[PDB]
CSV table of all heavy atoms in Angstrom, one decimal:
chain,number,residue,atom,x,y,z
A,5,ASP,N,11.3,1.4,6.3
A,5,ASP,CA,10.6,0.2,6.7
A,5,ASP,C,9.1,0.6,6.6
A,5,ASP,O,8.5,0.9,7.7
A,5,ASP,CB,10.9,-0.2,8.1
A,5,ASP,CG,12.4,-0.4,8.3
A,5,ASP,OD1,13.0,-1.1,7.5
A,5,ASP,OD2,12.9,0.1,9.3
A,6,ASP,N,8.5,0.5,5.5
A,6,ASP,CA,7.1,0.8,5.3
A,6,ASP,C,6.2,-0.3,5.8
A,6,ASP,O,6.5,-1.5,5.5
A,6,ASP,CB,6.8,1.2,3.8
A,6,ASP,CG,7.7,2.3,3.3
A,6,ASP,OD1,7.8,3.4,4.0
A,6,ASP,OD2,8.4,2.2,2.3
A,7,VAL,N,5.1,0.1,6.5
A,7,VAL,CA,4.1,-0.9,6.9
A,7,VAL,C,2.8,-0.3,6.4
A,7,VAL,O,2.5,0.9,6.5
A,7,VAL,CB,4.1,-1.0,8.5
A,7,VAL,CG1,4.8,0.2,9.2
A,7,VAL,CG2,2.7,-1.2,9.1
A,8,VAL,N,1.9,-1.2,6.0
A,8,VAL,CA,0.5,-0.9,5.8
A,8,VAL,C,-0.2,-0.9,7.2
A,8,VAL,O,-0.2,-1.8,7.9
A,8,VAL,CB,-0.2,-2.0,4.9
A,8,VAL,CG1,-1.7,-1.6,4.6
A,8,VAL,CG2,0.6,-2.3,3.6
A,9,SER,N,-0.8,0.3,7.5
A,9,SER,CA,-1.5,0.5,8.7
A,9,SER,C,-2.9,-0.2,8.6
A,9,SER,O,-3.3,-0.8,7.6
A,9,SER,CB,-1.8,2.0,9.0
A,9,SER,OG,-0.6,2.7,9.4
A,10,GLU,N,-3.5,-0.3,9.8
A,10,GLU,CA,-4.8,-0.9,9.9
A,10,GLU,C,-5.9,-0.1,9.1
A,10,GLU,O,-6.8,-0.7,8.6
A,10,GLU,CB,-5.2,-0.9,11.4
A,10,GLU,CG,-4.5,0.2,12.3
A,10,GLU,CD,-3.0,0.2,12.2
A,10,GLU,OE1,-2.3,-0.8,11.9
A,10,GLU,OE2,-2.3,1.2,12.6
A,11,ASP,N,-5.6,1.2,9.0
A,11,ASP,CA,-6.4,2.1,8.1
A,11,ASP,C,-6.2,1.9,6.6
A,11,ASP,O,-6.9,2.5,5.8
A,11,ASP,CB,-6.2,3.5,8.5
A,11,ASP,CG,-4.8,4.1,8.0
A,11,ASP,OD1,-4.0,3.3,7.5
A,11,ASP,OD2,-4.5,5.2,8.3
A,12,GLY,N,-5.3,1.0,6.2
A,12,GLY,CA,-5.1,0.6,4.8
A,12,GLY,C,-4.1,1.5,4.0
A,12,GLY,O,-4.0,1.4,2.8
A,13,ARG,N,-3.5,2.4,4.8
A,13,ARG,CA,-2.6,3.4,4.2
A,13,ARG,C,-1.1,3.2,4.7
A,13,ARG,O,-0.8,2.6,5.7
A,13,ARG,CB,-3.1,4.8,4.7
A,13,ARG,CG,-4.5,5.1,4.1
A,13,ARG,CD,-5.2,6.4,4.7
A,13,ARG,NE,-5.1,7.4,3.6
A,13,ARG,CZ,-6.1,7.7,2.8
A,13,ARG,NH1,-7.3,7.1,2.8
A,13,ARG,NH2,-5.9,8.6,1.9
A,14,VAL,N,-0.2,3.8,3.9
A,14,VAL,CA,1.2,3.8,4.2
A,14,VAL,C,1.7,5.2,4.6
A,14,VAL,O,1.8,6.0,3.7
A,14,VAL,CB,2.1,3.1,3.1
A,14,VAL,CG1,3.6,3.1,3.5
A,14,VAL,CG2,1.6,1.8,2.7
A,15,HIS,N,1.8,5.4,5.9
A,15,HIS,CA,2.1,6.7,6.4
A,15,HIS,C,3.6,6.9,6.5
A,15,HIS,O,4.2,7.0,7.6
A,15,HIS,CB,1.5,7.0,7.8
A,15,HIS,CG,0.0,6.8,7.8
A,15,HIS,ND1,-0.8,7.6,7.1
A,15,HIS,CD2,-0.8,5.9,8.4
A,15,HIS,CE1,-2.1,7.2,7.3
A,15,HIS,NE2,-2.1,6.2,8.1
A,16,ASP,N,4.2,7.1,5.3
A,16,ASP,CA,5.7,7.3,5.2
A,16,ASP,C,6.1,8.8,5.3
A,16,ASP,O,6.6,9.3,4.3
A,16,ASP,CB,6.3,6.5,4.0
A,16,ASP,CG,5.8,7.0,2.7
A,16,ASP,OD1,4.6,7.5,2.6
A,16,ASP,OD2,6.5,6.9,1.7
A,17,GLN,N,5.8,9.4,6.4
A,17,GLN,CA,6.1,10.8,6.7
A,17,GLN,C,7.6,11.0,6.6
A,17,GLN,O,8.1,12.0,6.2
A,17,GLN,CB,5.6,11.1,8.2
A,17,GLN,CG,5.6,12.6,8.5
A,17,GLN,CD,5.0,13.4,7.4
A,17,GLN,OE1,3.9,13.3,7.0
A,17,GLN,NE2,5.8,14.3,6.8
A,18,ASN,N,8.4,9.9,7.0
A,18,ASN,CA,9.8,10.0,6.8
A,18,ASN,C,10.3,10.1,5.4
A,18,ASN,O,11.3,10.8,5.2
A,18,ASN,CB,10.5,8.8,7.6
A,18,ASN,CG,9.9,7.4,7.3
A,18,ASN,OD1,9.1,7.2,6.3
A,18,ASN,ND2,10.2,6.5,8.1
A,19,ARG,N,9.6,9.6,4.4
A,19,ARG,CA,9.9,9.8,3.0
A,19,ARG,C,9.4,11.1,2.4
A,19,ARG,O,10.1,11.7,1.6
A,19,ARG,CB,9.3,8.6,2.1
A,19,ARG,CG,9.9,8.5,0.7
A,19,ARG,CD,9.4,7.3,0.0
A,19,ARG,NE,10.1,6.1,0.3
A,19,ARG,CZ,9.6,5.2,1.2
A,19,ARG,NH1,8.4,5.3,1.7
A,19,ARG,NH2,10.3,4.1,1.5
A,20,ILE,N,8.2,11.5,2.8
A,20,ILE,CA,7.7,12.9,2.5
A,20,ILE,C,8.8,13.9,3.0
A,20,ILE,O,9.2,14.7,2.1
A,20,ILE,CB,6.4,13.1,3.2
A,20,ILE,CG1,5.3,12.3,2.6
A,20,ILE,CG2,6.0,14.7,3.1
A,20,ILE,CD1,3.9,12.4,3.3
A,21,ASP,N,9.2,13.8,4.2
A,21,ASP,CA,10.2,14.7,4.7
A,21,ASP,C,11.5,14.7,3.9
A,21,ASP,O,12.1,15.7,3.7
A,21,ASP,CB,10.6,14.4,6.2
A,21,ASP,CG,9.5,14.8,7.2
A,21,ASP,OD1,8.5,15.4,6.8
A,21,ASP,OD2,9.7,14.6,8.4
A,22,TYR,N,11.8,13.5,3.5
A,22,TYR,CA,13.1,13.3,2.7
A,22,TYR,C,12.9,14.0,1.3
A,22,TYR,O,13.8,14.8,0.9
A,22,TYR,CB,13.4,11.8,2.6
A,22,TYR,CG,14.7,11.5,1.8
A,22,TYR,CD1,15.9,11.2,2.4
A,22,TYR,CD2,14.7,11.7,0.4
A,22,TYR,CE1,17.0,11.0,1.7
A,22,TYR,CE2,15.8,11.5,-0.3
A,22,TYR,CZ,17.0,11.1,0.3
A,22,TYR,OH,18.1,10.9,-0.5
A,23,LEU,N,11.9,13.7,0.6
A,23,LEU,CA,11.7,14.2,-0.7
A,23,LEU,C,11.6,15.8,-0.7
A,23,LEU,O,12.2,16.5,-1.5
A,23,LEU,CB,10.4,13.7,-1.3
A,23,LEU,CG,10.4,12.4,-2.2
A,23,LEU,CD1,11.8,11.8,-2.4
A,23,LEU,CD2,9.4,11.4,-1.7
A,24,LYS,N,10.7,16.3,0.2
A,24,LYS,CA,10.5,17.7,0.4
A,24,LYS,C,11.8,18.5,0.6
A,24,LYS,O,12.0,19.4,-0.1
A,24,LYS,CB,9.4,17.9,1.5
A,24,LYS,CG,9.5,19.3,2.1
A,24,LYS,CD,8.2,19.6,3.0
A,24,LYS,CE,7.5,20.7,2.5
A,24,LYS,NZ,8.4,21.9,2.3
A,25,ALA,N,12.6,18.0,1.6
A,25,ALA,CA,13.9,18.6,1.8
A,25,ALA,C,14.8,18.7,0.6
A,25,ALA,O,15.4,19.7,0.3
A,25,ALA,CB,14.6,18.0,2.9
A,26,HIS,N,14.9,17.6,-0.2
A,26,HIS,CA,15.8,17.6,-1.4
A,26,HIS,C,15.2,18.3,-2.6
A,26,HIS,O,16.0,19.0,-3.3
A,26,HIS,CB,16.1,16.1,-1.8
A,26,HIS,CG,16.9,15.4,-0.8
A,26,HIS,ND1,16.4,14.8,0.3
A,26,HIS,CD2,18.2,15.1,-0.8
A,26,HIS,CE1,17.3,14.3,1.0
A,26,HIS,NE2,18.5,14.4,0.4
A,27,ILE,N,13.9,18.2,-2.8
A,27,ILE,CA,13.2,19.0,-3.8
A,27,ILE,C,13.4,20.6,-3.5
A,27,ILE,O,13.6,21.3,-4.5
A,27,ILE,CB,11.7,18.7,-3.9
A,27,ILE,CG1,11.5,17.3,-4.6
A,27,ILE,CG2,10.9,19.8,-4.7
A,27,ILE,CD1,10.2,16.7,-4.4
A,28,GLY,N,13.4,20.9,-2.3
A,28,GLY,CA,13.7,22.3,-1.8
A,28,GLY,C,15.1,22.7,-2.2
A,28,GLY,O,15.3,23.9,-2.6
A,29,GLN,N,16.1,21.8,-2.0
A,29,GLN,CA,17.5,22.1,-2.4
A,29,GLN,C,17.7,22.2,-3.9
A,29,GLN,O,18.4,23.0,-4.4
A,29,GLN,CB,18.4,21.1,-1.7
A,29,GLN,CG,18.6,21.2,-0.2
A,29,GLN,CD,19.2,22.5,0.2
A,29,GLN,OE1,18.5,23.2,1.0
A,29,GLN,NE2,20.3,22.8,-0.3
A,30,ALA,N,16.9,21.4,-4.6
A,30,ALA,CA,17.0,21.4,-6.0
A,30,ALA,C,16.4,22.7,-6.6
A,30,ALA,O,16.9,23.3,-7.5
A,30,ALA,CB,16.3,20.2,-6.6
A,31,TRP,N,15.3,23.2,-5.9
A,31,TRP,CA,14.7,24.5,-6.3
A,31,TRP,C,15.8,25.6,-6.0
A,31,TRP,O,16.0,26.4,-6.9
A,31,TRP,CB,13.4,24.7,-5.4
A,31,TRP,CG,12.8,26.0,-5.7
A,31,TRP,CD1,11.8,26.3,-6.7
A,31,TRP,CD2,13.0,27.3,-5.1
A,31,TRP,NE1,11.5,27.6,-6.6
A,31,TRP,CE2,12.2,28.3,-5.7
A,31,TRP,CE3,13.9,27.7,-4.0
A,31,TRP,CZ2,12.2,29.6,-5.2
A,31,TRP,CZ3,13.9,29.0,-3.6
A,31,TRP,CH2,13.1,30.0,-4.2
A,32,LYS,N,16.4,25.5,-4.9
A,32,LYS,CA,17.5,26.5,-4.6
A,32,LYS,C,18.6,26.6,-5.7
A,32,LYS,O,18.9,27.7,-6.1
A,32,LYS,CB,18.1,26.2,-3.2
A,32,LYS,CG,19.4,27.0,-2.9
A,32,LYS,CD,19.7,27.1,-1.4
A,32,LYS,CE,21.1,27.8,-1.2
A,32,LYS,NZ,21.6,27.5,0.1
A,33,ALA,N,19.1,25.4,-6.1
A,33,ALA,CA,20.0,25.3,-7.2
A,33,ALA,C,19.5,26.0,-8.5
A,33,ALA,O,20.3,26.6,-9.2
A,33,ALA,CB,20.3,23.8,-7.5
A,34,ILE,N,18.2,25.8,-8.8
A,34,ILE,CA,17.6,26.5,-10.0
A,34,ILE,C,17.6,28.0,-9.8
A,34,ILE,O,17.9,28.7,-10.8
A,34,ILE,CB,16.2,26.0,-10.2
A,34,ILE,CG1,16.3,24.5,-10.8
A,34,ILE,CG2,15.4,26.9,-11.2
A,34,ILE,CD1,14.9,23.9,-11.0
A,35,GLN,N,17.3,28.5,-8.6
A,35,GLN,CA,17.3,29.9,-8.3
A,35,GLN,C,18.7,30.5,-8.5
A,35,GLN,O,18.8,31.7,-8.9
A,35,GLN,CB,16.7,30.2,-6.9
A,35,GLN,CG,15.3,29.7,-6.7
A,35,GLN,CD,14.3,29.8,-7.9
A,35,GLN,OE1,14.0,30.9,-8.3
A,35,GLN,NE2,13.9,28.6,-8.3
A,36,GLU,N,19.7,29.7,-8.4
A,36,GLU,CA,21.1,30.2,-8.6
A,36,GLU,C,21.7,29.9,-9.9
A,36,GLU,O,22.9,29.9,-10.2
A,36,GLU,CB,22.0,29.8,-7.5
A,36,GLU,CG,21.6,30.2,-6.1
A,36,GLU,CD,22.4,29.6,-5.0
A,36,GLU,OE1,23.6,29.2,-5.3
A,36,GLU,OE2,22.0,29.6,-3.9
A,37,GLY,N,20.8,29.5,-10.9
A,37,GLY,CA,21.2,29.4,-12.3
A,37,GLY,C,21.5,28.0,-12.8
A,37,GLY,O,21.9,27.9,-14.0
A,38,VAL,N,21.4,26.9,-12.1
A,38,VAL,CA,21.7,25.6,-12.6
A,38,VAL,C,20.6,25.3,-13.6
A,38,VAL,O,19.4,25.4,-13.2
A,38,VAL,CB,21.8,24.5,-11.5
A,38,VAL,CG1,21.8,23.1,-12.1
A,38,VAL,CG2,23.0,24.8,-10.5
């Protein structure tokens, strides 16, 4: 549920956290030869 803040920005820390965690797991898969 993204909202535009009063500062004019969308602080979707929850999505950053989501992407970062999965990109990390994808990196791991690459390290093991996928």
Side-chain angles (χ1 to χ4, degrees):
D5 308 307
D6 305 309
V7 21
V8 185
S9 288
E10 26 302 341
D11 73 359
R13 298 172 105 98
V14 184
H15 303 296
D16 64 332
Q17 196 41 64
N18 47 16
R19 195 173 281 103
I20 289 172
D21 284 1
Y22 181 104
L23 270 358
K24 159 168 240 305
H26 293 79
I27 288 162
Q29 290 297 124
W31 181 91
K32 168 159 174 198
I34 288 179
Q35 303 323 292
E36 300 174 23
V38 166

